[PDB]
């Protein structure tokens, strides 16, 4: 299928302590595989899934020096942004970044990403063309002109089309009997009496990966978006996920209702009713 890599970076300033905390998490196919954190005793990119221990000390030392560079980059940028937004001292501030690449099933670059947010808010992003920048804020225009005049987009384009792709290829080959799995959901339906003449039927899906899933209810034919309650997909804590969707229903006439579970690990959508 298709594949991806992302680095998610964060720097947080606080009123007191004299330097921002910086954290970077790498993901391959939306699963964590590296991590650097400046608060750690040994600030260094540590590995995060079994398959990454294949890398020699030369890989970790280079990546760690890279993170130290980013930390200092985030540090100066935080300073500059404070001035750009005429923010005084004595506050908390956040600078975040997402970057990476999406491959197709043919292992070629589909899309590159480079995005920044300040205070949790879109600040500047490299457009899909990997040549021009989107920056909504008036304050962000200063950064955008600076980066337009410096050929920054060329530098990021080369990483995204080159290193990002080349090294993701490499990471997939090393953990092939690892990230080439999906756990299908196990669904069941439970029954919950309420205000009589009526009853809540609750469709459960358990033990699935990845997290994307859809649960529908049907009154013998047409789907029910009202008032179908659901929860947001949640981690079970063991790598798998959980979800439920419920619909309230006349007591006795409940065998009319059907629940469907759509997941990318199923050979086909599952179909389910209440079983007394």
């Amino acid at each position: 299928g298709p594949h991806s890599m992302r680095y998610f970076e964060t720097a947080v300033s606080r009123p007191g302590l004299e330097e921002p905390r910086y954290i970077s998490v790498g993901y391959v196919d939306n699963k964590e595989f590296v991590r650097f954190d400046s608060d750690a005793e040994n600030p260094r990119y540590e590995p995060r899934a079994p398959w990454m221990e294949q890398e020699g000390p030369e890989y970790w030392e280079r990546e760690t020096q890279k993170a130290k560079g980013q930390e200092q980059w985030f540090r100066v940028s935080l300073r500059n942004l404070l001035g750009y937004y005429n923010q005084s001292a004595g506050g908390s501030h956040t600078l975040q970044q997402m970057s990476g690449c999406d491959l197709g099933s043919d292992w070629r670059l589909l899309r590159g990403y480079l995005q920044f947010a300040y205070e949790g808010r879109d600040y500047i992003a490299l457009n899909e063309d990997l040549k021009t920048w989107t920056a909504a804020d008036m304050a962000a225009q200063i950064t955008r002109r600076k980066w337009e005049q410096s050929g920054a987009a060329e530098h990021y384009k080369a990483y995204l089309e080159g290193e990002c792709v080349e090294w993701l290829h490499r990471y997939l080959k090393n953990g092939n009997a690892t990230l080439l799995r999906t756990d299908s959901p196990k669904a069941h339906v439970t029954h919950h009496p309420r205000s009589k003449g009526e009853v809540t039927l609750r469709c459960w899906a358990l033990g699935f990966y990845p997290a994307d899933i859809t649960l529908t209810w049907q009154l013998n034919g047409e789907e029910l978006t009202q008032d179908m309650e659901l929860v947001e997909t949640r981690p079970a804590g063991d790598g798998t996920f959980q979800k439920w969707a419920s619909v309230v229903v006349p007591l006795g006439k409940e065998q009319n209702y059907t629940c469907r579970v759509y997941h990318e690990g199923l050979p086909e959508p599952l179909t389910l009713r209440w079983e007394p």
Partner: peptide
């Protein structure tokens, strides 16, 4: 492989 950034903001 991590990106390294170009000009600061």
């Amino acid at each position: 492989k991590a990106v390294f950034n170009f000009a600061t903001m």
